[PDB]
Every structure is written in C-alpha cells, then in structure tokens.
Amino acid sequence: ATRDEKITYLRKIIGDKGSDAWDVAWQEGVTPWDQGKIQPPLRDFIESNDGKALVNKKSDNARVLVPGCGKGYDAAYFASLGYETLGADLSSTAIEKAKEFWAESPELKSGKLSFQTLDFFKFEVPEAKYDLVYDYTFFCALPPDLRAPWGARMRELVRPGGTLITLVYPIDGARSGGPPYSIDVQKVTDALQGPGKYWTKVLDIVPQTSSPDHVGRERLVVWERIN
Ligand SMILES: Nc1ncnc2c1ncn2[C@@H]1O[C@H](CSCC[C@H](N)C(=O)O)[C@@H](O)[C@H]1O
C-alpha cells in the first residue's frame, strides 16, 4: 500500500531469498524504485559541454552497459544517443517489462538498444569491454558485502579510457537499512579502488536539476578508467 510498506516487505524477501528476491519483487509488482523516467541529472550532464565531450569522442562502436537497468529508462536514453546499449537486469520479469515498455522504440527495433537477463557479477565481459557504464540505483541496491565485487567487476567492464557514470543516490547519512542503502561518494570510491590507482574521478557535482525527492541526496560523479 505505502512505499514504506513495499520497502519493508522488499527487505523481508531479500533476507529470505537473497538475490533471487529480485525477480519475485518484480513479479509481485513490489517495485518502489521504479520512476518511469531517467533521472534529470543524467540528461543534463549529457546535454552539458562536459557530457558533449563524451558523445563526440564516441566511435560508431561505442558500447554502453546499464547494469541493474530495471525497466531500462537509462538504457533506452543512451541508445537514442546512438550508443549501442545493453540493459541488463537479474530479473527476467523486469527485462520482459522493459521489452514491453520500450516496444515502440526505434532502437529496440534496430537492435541498437538491447535488454538481457544477466547477473552483473556472472556474465561474460565481451572482448572489447564497454566505453560507458551508468550505475543508478544499482550500487545502492547491493548489500554492503557486494560493494567490492561490484567495484572489481566495474574495473573489468570499462575499457581503459572508458567512463563510468555513477548517480550516487541516496546520500542519506547513517540510515542502516537497505535496499536502497545509504551510500556516499566515499563508499563508491573505496569500492572502485580496492591514493586510488584504477580510476580518476574527473567530475563530482551536485546536479542543478534533481527530482524533487532527490534534492540534497544525490551527486553525479564521472569516473575515467585508467591503466
Ligand atoms: N547481480 C545483479 N545483476 C543485474 N541486476 C541486478 C542484480 N542484482 C539486482 N539487480 C537488479 O537491480 C535493480 C535494483 S532497482 C532497479 C534500478 C534501475 N536502475 C532503475 O533506475 O529503475 C533490480 O532490477 C534488480 O533486479
């Protein structure tokens, strides 16, 4: 009934069923995170001069991954910019729903956009790796003991010179609960370099245009993979 309820119950399934708790959550329609749109900071960054640095350096094979994509708004958005984009969720339900939601999209028709039931930690990183990965409500969905493997995986998935964009949310302080887990740029930083040797944090801003409930709980951070 209430979002507070859906969260409490979602955390109940997580404790009972682990990562399998996600496909049931999607099937039962317990999806309090789902907004129906990309977060505004993502579009604003991309249409910035800072983000137009990214999209004009793209080759024609520029590959985006959106892990934990849910109904895949963010994956759709990147596809429309010409990026050959993969949206990956653990839950086939979520990824069927994404296929419906985006059924009319020219990118889904043309294959430029693509949804696929994958375990972020398990699937075969392709030979060419990814030029761009976008993490939103994925890092904060993970239990704390999965933040280092998250970071280690991020290191293999992004080719050197690639970009990892992390909309860090929710920055809620000490909230001792999850999902969604209270995170901050420091928790992301530690996970990404297990003074930091695998990434440079090129840009770390508070977006000018957050969703109203995101205001003051959110920072866009852009990481460059370096070797
Ligand atoms: N190992 C894993 N691999 C891929 N997806 C995972 C995963 N563990 C959890 N997830 C998925 O990450 C999502 C957490 S919430 C959905 C977040 C989505 N990015 C959005 O903005 O709507 C769920 O869809 C869950 O199925």
Structure overview:
By secondary structure, the protein is an alpha/beta fold. The chain has a single domain (40-225), classed as Rossmann fold, CATH 3.40.50.150. The chain has helices at 3-17, 21-27, 40-47, 49-57, 73-80, 92-101, 106-110, 147-157, 185-192; strands at residues 63-67, 84-89, 113-117, 130-135, 158-168, 199-205, 219-225. Strand 4, helix 8 and strand 5 form a beta-alpha-beta unit. The longest helix has 15 residues, at 3-17. Bound molecules: S-adenosyl-L-homocysteine (SAH). S-adenosyl-L-homocysteine (SAH) binds at residues 19, 22, 33-34, 67-70, 88-91, 94, 119-121, 136-138, 141.
Terminal CA distance reads 49 Å
- Shape estimate: globular
Domain unit count: 1
Rg computed from alpha carbons, rounded to a whole number of angstroms:
17 Å
Bound molecules: S-adenosyl-L-homocysteine
